[PDB]
Design a protein around this ligand. Sequence first.
Ligand SMILES: NC(=O)c1ccc[n+]([C@@H]2O[C@H](COP(=O)([O-])OP(=O)(O)OC[C@H]3O[C@@H](n4cnc5c(N)ncnc54)[C@H](OP(=O)(O)O)[C@@H]3O)[C@@H](O)[C@H]2O)c1
Ligand SMILES: O=C(O)Cc1ccccc1O
Length: 315
Amino acid sequence: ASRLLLNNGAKMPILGLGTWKSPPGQVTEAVKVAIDVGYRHIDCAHVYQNENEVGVAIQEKLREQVVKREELFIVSKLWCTYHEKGLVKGACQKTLSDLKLDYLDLYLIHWPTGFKPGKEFFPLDESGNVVPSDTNILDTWAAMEELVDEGLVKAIGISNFNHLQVEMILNKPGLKYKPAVNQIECHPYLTQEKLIQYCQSKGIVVTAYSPLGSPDRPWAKPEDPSLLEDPRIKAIAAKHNKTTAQVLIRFPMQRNLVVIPKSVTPERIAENFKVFDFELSSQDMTTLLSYNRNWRVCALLSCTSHKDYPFHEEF
Ligand SMILES: NC(=O)c1ccc[n+]([C@@H]2O[C@H](COP(=O)([O-])OP(=O)(O)OC[C@H]3O[C@@H](n4cnc5c(N)ncnc54)[C@H](OP(=O)(O)O)[C@@H]3O)[C@@H](O)[C@H]2O)c1
Ligand SMILES: O=C(O)Cc1ccccc1O
């Protein structure tokens, strides 16, 4: 069941189900199976274009008395086109209506980069590059703070923020709510030891996304590395009578991180849950950390020139 304590007093399930790339015609079933198997944490976002169909699953399990609403921990994220002051509440309410809830447990700023408002998720000019908003991180944070005061979200957080951008929020004049969570990419090829040590020293919980290396990302190449097929990680799995996927989900848990693997496959959803009944040794852990290559799945390469692009700093 286990769970980590956030700085608002709530408890967050250390395992959750991810839904980026989960088709609208498969995800309702995937979330229904997850909840049956014992998942109590769903990771969502407006930009995934499937929050209505995730919502259908959640409502069905609530009607069925499988879970009560307080048992679930539902996360969504504010997309970059909604960073302006007067648009943050509207974006939150559209996500709440699609999911058919009256509050979210955790709401994140998806990326620190603000885009020009519009229907397009990545708005372009006549030259073909992304158009930025003139908004900043601190104003967007003040808008996220008033959602807490209004009762729409219980906790607020951030995603893909480097340590200097988190610093900016922690040092903000009149800061009312600290970020509860920083959701970042993390796996054996991108171990993030400095950003994790920094967040954990300030009482911010880390969530690890793309824990299996995201083999189904639409920009995948044949000569890219594959975590699931790494012989060295295959060896560690075989020693424990577990799968490679189970080892990759266990690894962040023993670093005190929340982990959110995605699957629409009922047998893999079940497999990803059976991770609470074994331990990686400190030797296994230190070996898995040594596999760091500084390789990113999610690099937001179209915004490399944005004033708030997060990945120019070391951590
Ligand atoms: N904050 C952000 O900016 C951000 C960015 C990226 C990701 N995330 C979140 O983190 C979640 C997880 O990361 P991700 O979706 O990039 O990738 P992932 O969880 O690392 O991997 C998903 C892929 O692995 C496959 N898989 C799942 N279980 C497996 C198993 N036991 N054996 C073999 N293959 C397995 C899935 O296939 P099937 O589905 O076909 O089973 C799918 O192809 C996302 O869905 C999203 O919720 C957030
Ligand atoms: O940031 C994420 O969660 C992954 C994602 C989803 C849709 C478009 C771009 C993109 O990087």
